Amino acid sequence: WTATSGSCKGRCFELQEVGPPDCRCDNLCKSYSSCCHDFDELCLKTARGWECTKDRCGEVRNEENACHCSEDCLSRGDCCTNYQVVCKGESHWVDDDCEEIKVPECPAGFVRPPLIIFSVDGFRASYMKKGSKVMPNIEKLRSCGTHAPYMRPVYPTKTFPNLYTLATGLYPESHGIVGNSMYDPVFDASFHLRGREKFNHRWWGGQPLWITATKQGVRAGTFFWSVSIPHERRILTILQWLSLPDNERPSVYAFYSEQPDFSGHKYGPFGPEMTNPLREIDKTVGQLMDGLKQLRLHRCVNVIFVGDHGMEDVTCDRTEFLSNYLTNVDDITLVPGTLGRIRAKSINNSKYDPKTIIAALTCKKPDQHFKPYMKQHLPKRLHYANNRRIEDIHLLVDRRWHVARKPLDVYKKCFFQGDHGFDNKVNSMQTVFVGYGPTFKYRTKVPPFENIELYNVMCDLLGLKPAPNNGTHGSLNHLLRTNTFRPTMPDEVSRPNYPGIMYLQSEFDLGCTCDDKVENKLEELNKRLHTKGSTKERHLLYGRPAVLYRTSYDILYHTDFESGYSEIFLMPLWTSYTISKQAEVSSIPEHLTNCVRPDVRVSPGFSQNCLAYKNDKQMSYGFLFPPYLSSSPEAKYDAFLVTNMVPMYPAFKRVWAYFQRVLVKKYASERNGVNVISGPIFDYNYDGLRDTEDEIKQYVEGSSIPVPTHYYSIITSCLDFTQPADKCDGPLSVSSFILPHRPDNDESCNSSEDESKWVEELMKMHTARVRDIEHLTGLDFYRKTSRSYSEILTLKTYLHTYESE
Ligand SMILES: *[C@@H]1O[C@H](CO)[C@@H](O[C@@H]2O[C@H](CO)[C@@H](O[C@@H]3O[C@H](CO[C@H]4O[C@H](CO)[C@@H](O)[C@H](O[C@H]5O[C@H](CO)[C@@H](O)[C@H](O)[C@@H]5O[C@H]5O[C@H](CO)[C@@H](O)[C@H](O)[C@@H]5O)[C@@H]4O)[C@@H](O)[C@H](O[C@H]4O[C@H](CO)[C@@H](O)[C@H](O)[C@@H]4O[C@H]4O[C@H](CO)[C@@H](O)[C@H](O)[C@@H]4O)[C@@H]3O)[C@H](O)[C@H]2NC(C)=O)[C@H](O)[C@H]1NC(C)=O
Ligand SMILES: Cc1nnn(Cc2cc(C(F)(F)F)ccc2/C=C/C(=O)N(C)CCOc2ccccc2)n1
Ligand SMILES: [Ca+2]
Ligand SMILES: [Ca+2]
Ligand SMILES: [Cl-]
Ligand SMILES: [K+]
Ligand code: NA
Ligand SMILES: [Zn+2]
Asked: Which residues are noted in the entry as Ca(2+)-binding?
């Protein structure tokens, strides 16, 4: 209930929104159906349009008018944005040459440069080049400011998850807005774009930028706009707020455009009808910049032009129907479209089995355009599992496609030609970033980066301390002229032991065997030196990783590789080795096929054993340092040490062996040497963080050997590939993966074929940032380089996406 017969006089777009049944005059009153009776008359004036004309110059102020052309308007802050151009012979901002903004040039009384976030829904990254002729204002922001070729959205590439990630720096699984539509089973309530439940604050986790600002004494304009408030009115409202007295004036604002998304759905990302919405957005940016220029704020404000996601071609005919795969289709609820989320229609259904639903949806049609997953098996780079609002069963849908439950759903609701929501690596889902102003760099292009990083930078721009978030603070320092954040490397928590030879062969009763009783002082001092770490600078090129949690571990040196061996998990946390361009792949000799050798530096009690693997009919083993890449027949023996062994399903060993035998050498050949660090990951609770030992749900039968959920590798070389990996003078290049350690290859529909036809594609699907591996292991990599730490943080957030240009 609203007493809508209070008034909006003097209250239009009030920043402190008032409590029911007192009526409202804020940005969102329309959305709540709670505006005072006179809101439209007083706050949504339209009389005479949005532009000054020659006859209106120096007019008498008429309060009915949408904006003003009178002499007093500038003091008041409510001139039409083109007032100085029409009435004072000024030029439009877009027609002025750009000039470096070295320092904020702000009116007296401004304590910090304001920040204006200009957010555009569905603005696909390629619009910057493809629409450049019709977007002169945006092109000036882009060419004169700092820009990335594209910005990576989060998954799912929907509006609400992405705007709220922008606001918070958090993955959807952490902020809780995991879709445009959601069921929370704790609340037993549903969240939808249309309706009232989305207004409840219990949906919205983390701490968005406007709250961060308020908590720290920085006033914020309201970020949200009701759809019926015209764009010119949103711009004029921001320009009036900027004219408030110092004590009332916000320092941070957002504008939101529903375009070009709205038209993109109807006409496709590049429909001829798309030109007009792009023109209209540009004119809005123009009105803002002209308006700032009139207020002498155009070299004072930092402006961010940013999108939430792109737009792909998707039509009705490109729909897969679950009714074509499932006989029980009415016993499930599907969240449909450009992703699928499945749960049971009724929690009282005891015969609902997710395992049989997944099997019925797996590799059933030759060109099947979606892939089912238990959410914990989704690529770790999506960070899309650790929320009760995300259903256990997920469908990753191919770009250009929809999934629906039954044909009736699609023709009882062709309407649309564009949609979005797909995997956030997909080129069509990429969006835009431009920063322009005194705090951003001048005429600078930066590499693509993820939208989770922006909250930290917006905090830097405003002098705020960010709430804990998923950005890596410092990794975007290269966007900024000043206000950079200078972090220190985290402190190592556990120091390693460096064990020497302390055990006799016969102390080990591991059920292991090796044919190694082979027979010199020239070569014996040599092997001892290698065991003392003489080759370690070749194989540990960027220093040893730091262990950031409490544990007991040993550094083990060898001719070809160095490892940090966990006495708790009975295997390496990490294994590091360098493979030059010239290196040769050899085979495992016949005599060594089932060889596993005791490591006389490590107690039998801290070792794996072969009997456990023999007993465990499901589990086999592999090696972290590949025997195939040994430098010599003699060095090869080190690769068979029980301390280089890890538990591996036979199905996974196909993957691992092809990676180690074929791909490592291929990358060394393509990149001029590679350094590789590989290791296990344990993430049984799918939270993206390193498990403690008491979280482990599976061990090798009858043993204390924990089974990894994933295996990682980080493959580093010189960015200038004319220099070998081990003699690199400048910036580095990295690609990494987090491969799921699965007992079958059901994920890969073509896995009955030769590994050359499917393994590399699997690895590409599971591409990862070094930072993702750090969260999952509690390690910190690249500790000893000569590069600036900010540059290393950028390297650690890099994701190799394997999309064309
Ligand atoms: C991305 O960045 C974010 C931000 O840094 C990282 O998320 C953090 O991860 C931390 C580790 O998991 C986590 O710390 C926990 O906090 C608990 C207190 O939580 C409340 O307070 C904070 C601060 O105000 C608040 O932000 C939280 O908000 C969450 O929960 C509400 C629901 O009420 C949501 O609205 C909101 O969206 C958000 O949800 C997300 O986080 C939770 C986990 O907290 C998930 O379950 C959700 O799915 C969703 O992802 C909270 O309101 C605190 O109680 C925890 O302490 C327990 O665990 C520690 C381990 O050290 C143990 O020592 C303690 O004793 C304690 O254990 C006891 O409780 C157990 C569970 O009930 C029980 O089993 C035991 O027996 C014990 O009695 C813990 O410290 C932090 O909250 C979140 N923050 C956010 C914002 O999500 C994230 O990890 C990063 N991601 C990656 C990949 O790096
Ligand atoms: C989602 C989400 N999360 N945060 N925002 C605000 C926002 C943020 C940011 C950013 F980039 F700076 F972060 C930029 C713009 C916005 C504004 C969004 C907006 O005006 N709309 C989506 C229309 C009205 O929508 C609603 C939504 C809920 C309730 C009532 C109305 N939107
Ligand atoms: Ca959107
Ligand atoms: Ca975990
Ligand atoms: Cl959704
Ligand atoms: K076995
Ligand atoms: Na398969
Ligand atoms: Zn959309």
From this structure: 683, 685, 687, 689, 691
